Amino acid sequence: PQITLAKRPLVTIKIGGQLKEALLDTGADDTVLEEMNLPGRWKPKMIGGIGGFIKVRQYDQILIEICGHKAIGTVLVGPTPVNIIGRNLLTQIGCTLNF
Amino acid sequence: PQITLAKRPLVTIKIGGQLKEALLDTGADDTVLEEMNLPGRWKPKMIGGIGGFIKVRQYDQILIEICGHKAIGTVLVGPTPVNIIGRNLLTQIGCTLNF
Numbered sequence: 001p002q003i004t005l006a007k008r009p010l011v012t013i014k015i016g017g018q019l020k021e022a023l024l025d026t027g028a029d030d031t032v033l034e035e036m037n038l039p040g041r042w043k044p045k046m047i048g049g050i051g052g053f054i055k056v057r058q059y060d061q062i063l064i065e066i067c068g069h070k071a072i073g074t075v076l077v078g079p080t081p082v083n084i085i086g087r088n089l090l091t092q093i094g095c096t097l098n099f
Numbered sequence: 100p101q102i103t104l105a106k107r108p109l110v111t112i113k114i115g116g117q118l119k120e121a122l123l124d125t126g127a128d129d130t131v132l133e134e135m136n137l138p139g140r141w142k143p144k145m146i147g148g149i150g151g152f153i154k155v156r157q158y159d160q161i162l163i164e165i166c167g168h169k170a171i172g173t174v175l176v177g178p179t180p181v182n183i184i185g186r187n188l189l190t191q192i193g194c195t196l197n198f
């Protein structure tokens with residue numbers, strides 16, 4: 001589709017067999033999900049943003065469906081106040097910016 | 100222009116009599132720039148992201164140009180490590196996400 005930006009670009013996703021919404025985020029290199037249960041091995045990492053840093057669990061090879069398109073890749077889980085799909089999955093679903 | 104997302108979507112902007120590089124950010128409500136001098140007597144403002152909140156300065160009716168598309172709006176300034184163009188300006192230049 002084509003999504004305008006007068007509102008937050010919040011879309012429906014499926015991950016871990018759960019429906020959620022997430023922000024399609026051109027300014028995020030990575031994908032960061034609100035605190036949840038995911039099965040699998042992970043490893044601690046740390047990410048930085050506006051407020052500073054946070055600890056997150058990194059999981060690789062996680063599948064997510066975003067507005068009907070599938071992507072598989074790394075996902076970080078931690079205390080973000082919003083789920084964020086970053087350029088790592090956005091490129092897989094063919095997403096681009098246009099003006 | 101069509102921008103893809105293998106790399107950070109950095110473009111060149113003109114603001115405040117200065118040329119700068121910044122990130123087109125669909126997950127930023129507001130535009131936020133690294134410390135510079137701007138025209139006007141600013142109002143304080145709180146913004147949050149990954150890691151909590153920071154206090155920044157808000158300057159309204161600021162002239163900005165992005166890839167030759169002019170826009171006027173609020174621009175915040177404070178301790179971002181990167182310049183960010185938020186949806187407040189992205190909608191003015193007719194920017195959309197597409198897939």
Ligand SMILES: CC(C)[C@H](NC(=O)[C@H](C)NC(=O)OCc1ccccc1)C(=O)N[C@@H](Cc1ccccc1)[C@@H](O)[C@H](O)[C@H](Cc1ccccc1)NC(=O)[C@@H](NC(=O)[C@H](C)NC(=O)OCc1ccccc1)C(C)C
Nearest residue numbers: 027028029046047048049050126127128145146147148149
């Ligand atoms: C991982 C990402 C989330 C991202 N950071 C990165 O990509 C970093 C630098 N990458 C990285 O990989 O480094 C860590 C690392 C190190 C070692 C190993 C592994 C990893 C990030 O924070 N990205 C931000 C840009 C940035 C980049 C570098 C440094 C600082 C900032 C925005 O693009 C990103 O789009 C976030 C998304 C977001 C939205 C909401 C909550 C949390 C995060 N938006 C924001 O941070 C913006 N906030 C907003 O848009 C908020 C929600 N609005 C707002 O606060 O308005 C007023 C308000 C007032 C009162 C209450 C509420 C709101 C902010 C820039 C304006």
